[PDB]
Amino acid sequence: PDPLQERDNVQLRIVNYILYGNGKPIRGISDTSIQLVRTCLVLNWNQDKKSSSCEEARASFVEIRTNGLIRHFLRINLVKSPISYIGKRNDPSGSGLLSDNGSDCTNINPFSSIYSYSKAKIQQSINQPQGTIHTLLNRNKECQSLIILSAANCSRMGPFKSLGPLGTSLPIENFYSSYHLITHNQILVTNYLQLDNLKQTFQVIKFKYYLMDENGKIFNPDPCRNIILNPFNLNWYFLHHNYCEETSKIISLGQFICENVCIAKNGPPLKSGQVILVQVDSIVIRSAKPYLATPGATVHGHYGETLYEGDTLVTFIYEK
């Protein structure tokens, strides 16, 4: 008996029943006396009124070894139907396949972290395909799916043929005007800015660079022009907005290019895929394969639907 006792699902009840039936006397042996009243103990887990519960308890021997002395104290524990604990405070002390095994981080003791170090020494699995997780917006609303893009799917075609943190914007005193906006859209300006102010041609001020010191004095080599200060060298330069750049792109992003197209006499593109990446000197094409259909055929899938190997794409109804 203990002053403070907790509560458990497993319960115990004592059942005492008569040995023989009433009205029928059995023969009594002269050597062994008959047992009129008997008693027994049963172990039944608590069952809720809504759902009946069946006791699941197993008995395992536990022996404490002290100089070759064994304790025949077999502890009986009941495995609750809940697979997981509601809270870590009410969680069981041991939750593992093997108690002796220390590969688990929880099984490893904090004072002796040799098991934790041995577990961390183990390398990660190769289940990940070493690619980029490409989600599907088509299946985004419903149960989502994932496409993994790796080096097997994407290839680099090969060689086909100043700049700095100028500054940081300061707060505006006339906040009511559209000065917090650093630029205006062609399309969206109409919605937010009455063009009465901008009706005059070039009414809005052109790009100017107004540098301010710690004291608060506006400074610039040209009074109201577009000379820019380098942060590191602390010397003024021009950004070269025109940039003197005249380059033509012979491949646009997202264009599906078949085989033998021969973009130039030297190198013909391949892989029959879409152009996912366009760099200065190289293009990356995600491999694909064209399927020529015909009018009257049926396409068994939506736009963003994943097709596995062996799945049916189109059904052709050729006459015989």
Counting contacts by CB under 8 A, is residue 237 touching other proteins?
no
Rank residues 31 and 243 by Cβ distance to other proteins and give the closer one.
Answer: 243
Tokens at 229, concatenated: 């200060």
Counting contacts by CB under 8 A, is residue 207 touching other proteins?
yes
What gap in Å lies between CA 218 and CA 167, rounded to an integer?
14
String marking each residue 165-204 x if it binds other proteins according to CB under 8 A = xxxxxxxxxxxxxxxxxxxxxxxxx-xxxx---------x
Counting contacts by CB under 8 A, is residue 67 touching other proteins?
yes
CB 72 within 8 A of CB 61: yes
Contacts with other proteins by CB under 8 A: the residue count is 196
Please report how close the Cβ of residue 25 comes to other proteins at its closest, in angstroms: 14
In the set 200, 217, 317, 320, which binds other proteins (CB under 8 A)? 217
Counting contacts by CB under 8 A, is residue 131 touching other proteins?
yes
Q: How many CB atoms lie within 10 A of CB 156?
A: 12
Please report how close the Cβ of residue 78 comes to other proteins at its closest, in angstroms: 14
Counting contacts by CB under 8 A, is residue 232 touching other proteins?
yes
Which run of H or E residues covers position 116?
Answer: helix 114-121
3-state secondary structure of 118: helix
Q: What is the dihedral of CA 313, 316, 317, 318, to 10 degrees?
A: -150
Rank residues 32 and 291 by Cβ distance to other proteins and give the closer one.
Answer: 291
Counting contacts by CB under 8 A, is residue 37 touching other proteins?
yes
Q: How many CB atoms lie within 10 A of CB 226?
A: 13
CA dist list (Å): 229 to 119, 186, 226, 266:
55, 29, 10, 45
In the set 71, 81, 96, 238, which binds other proteins (CB under 8 A)? 71
In the set 296, 316, 317, 320, which binds other proteins (CB under 8 A)? 296
What gap in Å lies between CA 51 and CA 246, rounded to an integer?
78
Phi, then psi, of 74 in degrees rounded to 5: -90, 105
Please report how close the Cβ of residue 27 comes to other proteins at its closest, in angstroms: 15
Please report how close the Cβ of residue 33 comes to other proteins at its closest, in angstroms: 18
Query: ∠ CA(162), CA(167), CA(172), 5° rounding?
Result: 140
Beta bridge partners of 159: none
What gap in Å lies between CA 304 and CA 84, rounded to an integer?
38
Please report how close the Cβ of residue 31 comes to other proteins at its closest, in angstroms: 20
Counting contacts by CB under 8 A, is residue 36 touching other proteins?
no
Applying the rule CB under 8 A, the residues between 1 and 20 that interact with other proteins are 1-7, 11-20
In the set 49, 249, 316, 320, which binds other proteins (CB under 8 A)? 249
Counting contacts by CB under 8 A, is residue 96 touching other proteins?
no
Counting contacts by CB under 8 A, is residue 62 touching other proteins?
yes
What gap in Å lies between CA 38 and CA 33, rounded to an integer?
13
3-state secondary structure of 163: coil
Counting contacts by CB under 8 A, is residue 316 touching other proteins?
no
CA dist list (Å): 248 to 56, 80, 276:
76, 71, 18
String marking each residue 253-292 x if it binds other proteins according to CB under 8 A = xxxxxxxxxxxxx------xxxxxxxxx-----xxxxxxx
Counting contacts by CB under 8 A, is residue 317 touching other proteins?
no
In the set 57, 78, 80, 211, which binds other proteins (CB under 8 A)? 211
Rank residues 30 and 64 by Cβ distance to other proteins and give the closer one.
Answer: 64
